[PDB]
Amino acid sequence: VASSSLRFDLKSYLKERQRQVEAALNAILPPQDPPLIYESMRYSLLAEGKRLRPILCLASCELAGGTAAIALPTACALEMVHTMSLIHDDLPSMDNDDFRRGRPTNHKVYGEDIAILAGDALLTYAFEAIARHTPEVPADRVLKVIAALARAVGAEGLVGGQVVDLQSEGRDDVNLETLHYIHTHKTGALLEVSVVSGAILAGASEELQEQLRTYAQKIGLAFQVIDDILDITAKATYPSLLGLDASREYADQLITEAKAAIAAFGAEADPLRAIADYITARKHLLE
Amino acid sequence: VASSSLRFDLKSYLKERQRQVEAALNAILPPQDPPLIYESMRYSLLAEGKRLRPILCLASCELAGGTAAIALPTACALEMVHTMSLIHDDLPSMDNDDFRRGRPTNHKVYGEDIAILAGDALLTYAFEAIARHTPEVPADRVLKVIAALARAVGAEGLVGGQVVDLQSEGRDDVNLETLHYIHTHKTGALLEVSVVSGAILAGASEELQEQLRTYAQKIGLAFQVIDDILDITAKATYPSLLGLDASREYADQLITEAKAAIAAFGAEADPLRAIADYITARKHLL
Ligand SMILES: C=C(C)CCOP(=O)(O)OP(=O)(O)O
Ligand SMILES: [Cl-]
Ligand SMILES: [Mg+2]
Ligand SMILES: [Mg+2]
Ligand SMILES: [Mg+2]
Ligand SMILES: [Mg+2]
Ligand SMILES: [Mg+2]
Ligand SMILES: [Mg+2]
3-state secondary structure chain A: CCCCCCCCCHHHHHHHHHHHHHHHHHHHCCCCCCHHHHHHHHHHHCCCCCCHHHHHHHHHHHHCCCCHHHHHHHHHHHHHHHHHHHHHHHCCCCCCCCEECCEECHHHHHCHHHHHHHHHHHHHHHHHHHHHHCCCCCHHHHHHHHHHHHHHHCCCCHHHHHHHHHHHCCCCCCCHHHHHHHHHHHHHHHHHHHHHHHHHHHCCCHHHHHHHHHHHHHHHHHHHHHHHHHHHHCCCCHHHHHCHHHHHHHHHHHHHHHHHHCCCCCHHHHHHHHHHHHHHHHHHCCC
Mutation pick for ligand 1 pocket among A86, A96, A168 (CB with most ligand atoms within 8 Å) = A86
Residue A86 beta carbon below 6 angstroms from any ligand 1 atom: yes
**Residues of chain B numbered 30-69 and touching chain A (CB < 8 Å):** 32-34, 36-38, 41
Radius of gyration of chain B (CA): 19
Ligand 2: centre distance to CA A50 (Å) = 6
A97 assigned to a ligand binding site: yes
DSSP label at residue B262: T
**CA atoms within 13 A of residue A98's CA, in its CB half-sphere:** 0
Q: What H or E segment, with its residue span, contains residue B100?
A: strand B99-100
Experimental technique used to determine this entry:
X-ray
Q: Which residue in A has a C-alpha nearest to residue B153's C-alpha?
A: A124
From B130, B110, B42, B36, select the one nearest A160 (Cα to Cα). B36
Min Cα distance A160 → chain B (Å) is 6
Tell me whether A160 touches chain B (CB under 8 Å): yes
For ligand 1, atom 6, the nearest C-alpha belongs to A89
A186 lines ligand 1 (CB under 6 A): yes
Gap between the Cα atoms of B70 and A277, Å rounded = 48
- Partners of A99 in the beta sheet? A104
Residue B26 C-alpha to ligand 4 middle, in angstroms? 33
Rounded to whole angstroms, the Cα distance separating A229 from A280 reads 13
Comparing CA positions, the residue from B7, A148, B218 lying closest to residue B226 is B218
Q: Is A106 in the pocket of ligand 1 (CB under 6 A)?
A: no
A89 is in an annotated binding site: yes
Distance CA(B86)–CA(B96), nearest Å, equals 11
Q: If you measure from the C-alpha of residue A239 to the centroid of ligand 7, how many angstroms do you get, rounded to a whole number?
A: 47
Q: Judge whether B136 is closer than 8 Å to chain A, CB to CB.
A: no
The answer to whether B155 contacts A37, with C-beta atoms less than 8 Å apart, is yes
- Please state whether the peptide bond connecting residue A271 to the residue before it is cis, i.e. omega within 30 degrees of 0: no
Q: Which segments of chain B does DSSP mark as H helices, in order? A: 10-28, 35-45, 52-63, 68-90, 106-110, 112-133, 139-153, 158-168, 176-182, 189-202, 206-233, 238-242, 244-261, 270-284
* Cα torsion angle, A10, A12, A13, A18, sign: positive
Q: Distance (Å) from the C-alpha of residue A225 to the closest C-alpha of chain B?
A: 23
Q: Does A127 touch chain B (CB under 8 A)?
A: yes
Alpha carbon distance B157, B161 (integer Å): 6
Residues whose CB falls within 8 Å of the CB of residue A276, separated by 6 or more in sequence, listed in order: A3, A4, A215, A219, A222, A255, A258, A259
What is the distance, to the nearest Å, from the Cα of residue B18 to the centroid of all Cα atoms in its chain? 14
DSSP state of B64: T
Chain A, nearest residue to B140 by Cα: A139
Residue A187 Cβ inside 6 Å of ligand 1? The answer reads yes
Contact B163 A114 (CB under 8 A): yes
> How far is A53 from chain B, CA to nearest CA, in Å?
18
The total number of structural domains that make up chain B: 1
CA-to-CA distance for B225 and B247, rounded, in angstroms?
7
d(C-alpha A160, C-alpha A153), whole Å: 8
Sign of the torsion angle spanned by Cα atoms A37, A39, A40, A46: positive
Centre of ligand 6 to C-alpha B161, Å, is 10
Question: Which residues on chain A are in Cβ contact (under 8 Å) with B142?
Answer: 139, 143
Question: Which residue range is the domain that position A65 belongs to?
Answer: 1-287
Question: A261 vs chain B: nearest CA distance in angstroms?
Answer: 27
Per DSSP, what are the bridge partners of residue B104?
A: B99
Going by C-alpha positions, the residue among A46, A117, A106, A94 that lies closest to residue B167 is: A117
For residue B99, the surrounding DSSP H or E stretch is: strand B99-100
* A166 within 8 A of B36, measured Cβ to Cβ: no
Residues of B in contact with A133 (CB under 8 A): none
For residue B192, give Cα distances in angstroms to B78, B197, B216, B219: 11, 8, 5, 10
DSSP B268: G
Single out the residue of A42, A197, A6, A27 nearest to residue A114, CA to CA.
A42
Cβ-proximal residues to B228 (8 Å cutoff; 6+ apart), any chain: B237, B238, B239, B247
B123 contacts in chain A (CB < 8 Å) = 120, 123-124
Residues B110 and B47: beta-carbon distance below 8 Å? no
Q: Find chain A residues with C-beta within 8 A of B144's C-beta.
A: 131
**Whose CA is closest to B220, among B183, B247, B256, B193?**
B183
Nearest chain A residue to B115 by CA distance is A93
Q: What contacts B171, CB < 8 A, 6 or more positions away? A: none
Burial string for B13-28 (b: 16+ CB within 10 Å, else e) reads bbeebbebbbebbeeb
Facing B163 at nearest CB: one of A36, A84, A94 = A36
Interface residue B117 vs chain A (CB under 8 A): yes
